[PDB]
Design a protein around this ligand. Sequence first.
Ligand code: HEM
Ligand code: HEM
Ligand SMILES: Cc1cc(Oc2ccc3c(c2)OCO3)nc(Oc2ccc(-n3ccnc3)cc2)n1
Ligand SMILES: Cc1cc(Oc2ccc3c(c2)OCO3)nc(Oc2ccc(-n3ccnc3)cc2)n1
Lengths: 290, 290
Amino acid sequence: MNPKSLTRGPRDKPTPLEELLPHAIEFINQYYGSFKEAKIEEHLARLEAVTKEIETTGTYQLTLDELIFATKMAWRNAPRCIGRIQWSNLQVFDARNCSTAQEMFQHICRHILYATNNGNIRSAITVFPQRSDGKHDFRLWNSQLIRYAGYRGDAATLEFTQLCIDLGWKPRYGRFDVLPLVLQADGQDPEVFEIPPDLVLEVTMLGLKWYALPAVANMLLEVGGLEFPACPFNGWYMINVAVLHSFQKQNVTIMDHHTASESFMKHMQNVLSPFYYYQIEPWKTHIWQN
Amino acid sequence: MNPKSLTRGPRDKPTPLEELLPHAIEFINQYYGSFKEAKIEEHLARLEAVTKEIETTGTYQLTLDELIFATKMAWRNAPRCIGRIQWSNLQVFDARNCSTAQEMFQHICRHILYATNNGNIRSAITVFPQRSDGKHDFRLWNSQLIRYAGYRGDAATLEFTQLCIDLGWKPRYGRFDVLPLVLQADGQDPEVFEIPPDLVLEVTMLGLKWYALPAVANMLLEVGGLEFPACPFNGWYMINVAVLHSFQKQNVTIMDHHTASESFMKHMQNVLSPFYYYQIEPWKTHIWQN
Ligand code: HEM
Ligand code: HEM
Ligand SMILES: Cc1cc(Oc2ccc3c(c2)OCO3)nc(Oc2ccc(-n3ccnc3)cc2)n1
Ligand SMILES: Cc1cc(Oc2ccc3c(c2)OCO3)nc(Oc2ccc(-n3ccnc3)cc2)n1
């Protein structure tokens, strides 16, 4: 067998132009190929402009339409995602001009707001600035945007919870404490941000509940040789029947037969690359500056 | 003399509870003893919970903190390891929930990535699921993660190379062919996985070169009576001066005076058991199912 690694790690230098160029060209082909017989002269003009940009600046910028296409094809290329059958239903938020952690925070609040939509969940992705030299990465240290702390609590976040504590987050001691956002901008040490409680929608099932929005915070989007290490996205959720009942009763989207049908109906009315990679946990690789 | 065996062999049955219990208790003591005067009541609570677990399930699970402590103490207890002077500099990857060979492969890719770090080598260990009845062992059949094939090539891998061939691996015939990973999961027949070439960093010294990452693939970690037969780890390397020059020139970590000092400085800023045992080569003991 010759499987590929599903993980894409850090760099300390910009991608060499001899590597970047061929990948960019191949992506540009995939993009314009989605027009088949149309736009041959536009295709050629874009190839020429991308090359000059790479040769003069060392890298290049995608157009908004190219980025939207990229996020949807990478979703389509996601092997285990059951949601990818309706890949055209995706809202993109372009945050490639973001510069600070405070700004990252505001972008994520907007994402959570739009995607939760009072319970009528919508799929979205927010794209932060692409990697440059690898020393100025944007990263979300959380694995999901919304997740409970573990001390009592979620057993699988003991490590990250302790980390938030080490960073000056005050630990409550319930079993449903929503962890803070831990946000790295421009390669700096991360900063801790409480999520405004009113942004977190929960479904009550004894005192049992769970958050409504499943959003992956920690993967990397690759496209045409460019890498975006910060690109949170969300879908909706897929002895056990209590939950299926509680979400429907409370009008929160899950992937039941009705939803599978309607979301597919909406879709129809509309080495793999591009691709979403896993990353190495940033607290294992980060060099602290203070 | 009464030396102990440095080898720990296979089982066909779970460890008897009368043997496991005392060993678990002694390890729990060693762990909480590293707090001296603190945590007497936590110590007692953990003893009680471990016993009930063993008495009801036949075995027990370490906490993440206990596993990290165990891997570092076993390194400290390694008689011939020169690296053990800085035993606190060790990154642990917890893979105890791994179930398939494809999954083992992805864990090892991640390990190789993190540890190589573009040449700035970091020590790491990846821990796979502990032994249960001895019939479902996880094992790496390689002796090191990275090693060259021998036909022409490395003279000391003729046997393993032939084995890879017998298993359907296509033999090149250079003298620097990187062997495939041969991975056993859940006691099944091993599967063969090519290592992605870009994951293998080499130092060029005539056409002479060598791989940068020395990683032992085939030992067993023992702790509190539990056995982990799959736990690859790595450090860095220790008429001959050509190599010492080439690694430094190419910015790949070796154990020279500068590195000895800095790694020790970082450490200070931070029957033996636990212990790493040797094993019997698995192709000598494995019963094939197909
Ligand atoms: C609309 C709702 C969606 C549903 C119901 C859905 C469902 C799933 C499920 C069930 C998994 C497997 C997780 C597991 O192993 O437990 C998965 C994985 C994943 N999903 Fe989604 N998803 C949705 C939306 C999205 C979106 C919007 C994206 C990205 C734009 C996406 C990207 C991925 C990726 C990259 C993985 C991992 C794939 C892999 O490792 O093979 N999903 N999804
Ligand atoms: C940081 C770099 C490290 C260096 C420079 C280093 C160096 C060495 C050397 C020179 C040997 C003797 C090999 C021989 O006989 O040729 C050795 C053996 C060994 N090392 Fe390391 N090591 C390092 C990291 C590690 C790590 C991370 C572990 C485990 C967590 C480890 C565990 C062992 C074990 C179990 C042996 C065999 C000990 C014995 O049989 O007496 N080493 N190491
Ligand atoms: C232990 C655990 C349990 C769950 O619960 C699920 C299970 C299945 C599923 C979920 C969450 O969202 C889409 O389909 N999620 C996670 O983390 C995830 C994984 C994937 C995920 N996702 C969103 C869109 N695509 C994948 C969200 C949250 N961890
Ligand atoms: C014939 C041969 C030659 C070498 O070369 C060395 C020698 C010394 C050394 C090495 C590799 O890594 C740490 O110190 N390694 C091996 O296999 C090993 C042994 C130990 C080893 N190791 C890594 C960490 N601790 C021990 C890695 C690879 N075999």
